[PDB]
């Protein structure tokens, strides 16, 4: 497919297939580029273009290894601001990719895993590159993500309420209470533990919740 060419002759055609939007061959060029020249001078920049070609072709299992490969090539880079975003971005596409949105159905209760794995990377990013342009974006991803977990965990804390499992209600909320200071899912789990307490005759603790209910409706 991609034969023995000069590396730039591979790379410009890879840049062509990137600018053609043909990530399929742009993956196929850049691999045999770094197969023929892993000692390529831009073999690191092959990977950044590869994850570019992976993600635009939606190729996270290739983008999983390459982000680890870029670390395993050299874990120190100026390009981690791409990569640590792109790993969270990989986890963002790994979080949810289904089509249920136009059905009036949301995906914020499905995967906490690559949610938190993105929340791992995006927090590492705003740790590792608070200077890079991604930090405006990645923080807003993190802003979105905690409530996405909260709504997910609210949907968990919903079920034990609809189950009536009030002991299983509380600690699910007690997680969110020691997780989220701002999320409205926590603000709306806030009345229910009071109820769960009053179903558990912990009315006294529930009026102590009802203060916070008053205080966080304030």
């Amino acid at each position: 497919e991609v034969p023995d060419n000069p590396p730039n002759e591979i790379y410009a055609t890879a840049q062509q297939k990137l600018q053609d939007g043909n990530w399929r061959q742009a993956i196929t060029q850049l691999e045999a580029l770094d197969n023929r020249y892993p000692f390529g001078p831009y073999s690191q920049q092959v990977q950044l273009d590869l994850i570019y070609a992976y993600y635009k072709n939606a190729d996270l299992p290739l983008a999983q290894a390459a982000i680890d490969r870029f670390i395993r090539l050299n874990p120190t880079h100026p390009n981690i601001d791409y990569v640590m975003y792109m790993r969270g971005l990989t986890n963002m596409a790994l979080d949810d990719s289904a089509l249920q949105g136009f059905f009036g159905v949301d995906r914020s209760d499905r995967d906490p895993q690559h949610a938190r794995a993105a929340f791992s990377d995006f927090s590492k990013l705003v740790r590792g590159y608070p200077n890079s342009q991604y930090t405006t974006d990645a923080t807003k991803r993190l802003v979105f993500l905690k409530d996405r977990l909260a709504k997910y965990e609210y949907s968990v804390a919903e079920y034990y309420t609809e189950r009536g499992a009030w002991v299983a209600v509380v600690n699910r909320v007690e997680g969110m209470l020691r997780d989220y200071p701002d999320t409205q899912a926590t603000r709306d789990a806030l009345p229910l533990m009071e109820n769960a307490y009053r179903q558990m005759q912990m009315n006294a603790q529930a009026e102590k919740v009802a203060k916070i209910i008053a205080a966080n409706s304030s």
Binding site: G164, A165, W166, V167, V170
Partner: protein
């Protein structure tokens, strides 16, 4: 309703009459933690108040419950033992 079939529901996290004898007011949470372990609830914004609370639905024959709240002080030295059944 008029349906004798209702499925049973249980909760867990309670203690025995031997277990409530295993501690006294004045004892540590650790002394509860040695004899009874911890329960699966305490008072998070307030003092050490350990909750061995049971809930149970039999199946359209009543509802069953046993609440055991164990208020220590902040030091974890026990200050209150309150057993509470259903209703």
């Amino acid at each position: 309703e008029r349906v004798v079939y209702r499925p049973d529901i249980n909760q867990g996290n309670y203690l025995t009459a031997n277990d409530v004898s295993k501690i006294r007011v004045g004892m540590t949470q650790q002394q509860v933690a040695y004899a009874l372990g911890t329960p699966l609830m305490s008072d998070p914004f307030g003092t050490n108040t350990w909750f061995y609370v049971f809930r149970q639905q039999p199946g359209h024959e009543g509802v069953t419950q046993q609440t055991l709240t164990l208020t220590f002080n902040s030091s974890g030295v026990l200050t209150n033992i309150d057993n509470k059944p259903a209703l």
